[PDB]
Ligand SMILES: CNCc1ccc2c(c1)N(C(=O)OCc1ccccc1)[C@H](CNC(=N)N)[C@H]2NC(=O)C(=O)Nc1ccc(Cl)c(F)c1
């Protein structure tokens with residue numbers, strides 16, 4: 123309804139690039155924030171049409187332009203060349219704050235699916251701290267649901283609409299390029315993956331009740347959406363999830379179909395230099411990988427799915443506003 127500002131813990135003395143950007147663009151966080159409950163009000167939210175998401179998307183585009191400069195950027199006809207130094211890159215949390223005379227309304231219902239009316243509301247001046255993590259298929263390093271796994275969609279009957287699964291317990295994923303230069307792998311505990319994909323099948327079943335629930339690898343598209351892609355320490359990883367989204371949930375029981383080995387699923391990955399950009403339609407070329415071991419240890423805290431008797435779900439992604447939505451869903455600017 124208005125333009126918001128960001129607050130952060132960044133420090134002007136980190137040269138990590140999120141820190142640099144935030145110290146120029148954000149104000150410091152209030153050490154003790156005000157929050158004002160109101161259990162009577164009942165207030166309508168819509169996470170799928172929330173202008174906080176558009177403002178955040180702008181900010182993160184700006185951060186990546188300042189920070190992860192490509193050697194070449196192809197946008198349509200044009201090709202732009204610049205210095206592409208290797209940088210230190212680790213996302214930090216960002217708070218979005220309402221300016222003077224507006225407030226941010228927070229929905230306090232633990233199972234609120236992001237849509238419709240909400241009974242227990244609050245007024246705050248800033249959101250919680252949201253780490254702007256760019257990735258597909260798996261949402262990393264977010265904040266888990268309080269109670270049960272929530273299923274969010276602008277419209278579950280429209281199978282073109284992305285489904286956000288909000289996990290209530292996180293699942294560890296560890297990706298490494300050991301000391302090819304391009305070759306890397308990720309490891310997930312097959313047990314924890316089994317467990318969470320069962321519970322996700324249960325919630326999906328509540329919404330599609332006759333049908334069998336199948337998980338299957340992403341069909342087609344750019345490598346960025348057909349693998350789980352993400353930035354780790356500056357380098358762009360592309361990890362094959364064919365052994366991860368691979369399993370059936372038949373009779374209130376889940377059966378994993380993908381290959382494990384000693385109780386860990388291992389995704390093969392490549393570090394790539396030609397990137398399809400998430401900010402706009404365009405390509406970006408980066409320098410070859412840094413030296414040594416490149417490792418990220420992340421929490422899978424949500425999933426992005428697309429639905430095709432039987433209902434089949436494939437990993438989705440590609441529109442980073444859904445990443446921001448998965449965090450901003452309980453908030454609304456007012457007044
Ligand atoms: C229903 N939604 C389907 C969908 C599928 C695929 C995409 C979108 C949307 N895009 C999308 O919405 O852009 C936002 C937008 C919206 C409206 C108008 C313009 C732009 C992307 C369009 N950009 C290209 N074509 N170059 C494409 N996504 C990626 O390229 C991607 O994620 N790359 C990547 C790079 C690095 C990392 Cl680390 C990473 F994790 C991922």
Ligand SMILES: *[C@@H]1O[C@H](CO)[C@@H](O)[C@H](O)[C@H]1NC(C)=O
Pocket residue numbers: 235236237238239273274275276277278
């Ligand atoms: C979310 O809840 C609303 C009612 O609050 C309901 O109308 C809508 O269908 C639900 N959507 C999903 C994806 O569960």
Ligand SMILES: *[C@@H]1O[C@H](CO)[C@@H](O)[C@H](O)[C@H]1NC(C)=O
Pocket residue numbers: 269270271290291321322324325
């Ligand atoms: C998370 O939610 C699921 C499904 O809604 C439920 O079965 C499970 O017990 C919950 N787990 C935890 C750790 O709260």
Ligand SMILES: *[C@@H]1O[C@H](CO)[C@@H](O)[C@H](O)[C@H]1NC(C)=O
Pocket residue numbers: 277278279280281
């Ligand atoms: C969402 O789903 C379908 C589109 O397939 C359509 O009936 C309408 O847009 C929506 N329906 C409901 C119940 O929201």
Ligand SMILES: *[C@@H]1O[C@H](CO)[C@@H](O)[C@H](O)[C@H]1NC(C)=O
Pocket residue numbers: 312313314316317376377378382384385386
């Ligand atoms: C879940 O993973 C463990 C580890 O391999 C396995 O022993 C167990 O049988 C699996 N459960 C399934 C596939 O339902």
Ligand SMILES: *[C@@H]1O[C@H](CO)[C@@H](O)[C@H](O)[C@H]1NC(C)=O
Pocket residue numbers: 345348349362363364
């Ligand atoms: C992932 O690996 C499988 C089997 O190794 C292969 O068939 C599939 O095409 C791969 N997908 C991508 C996007 O690399």
Ligand SMILES: *[C@@H]1O[C@H](CO)[C@@H](O)[C@H](O)[C@H]1NC(C)=O
Pocket residue numbers: 338339364365368379380381
């Ligand atoms: C599941 O994994 C196996 C081996 O890891 C693979 O052969 C199979 O094609 C995968 N399922 C699908 C639907 O791709």
Ligand SMILES: *[C@@H]1O[C@H](CO)[C@@H](O)[C@H](O)[C@H]1NC(C)=O
Pocket residue numbers: 212213255262263352353354417418419420421
């Ligand atoms: C997730 O957070 C951990 C701890 O801050 C970090 O080491 C890891 O690299 C993060 N993952 C991504 C993809 O940013």
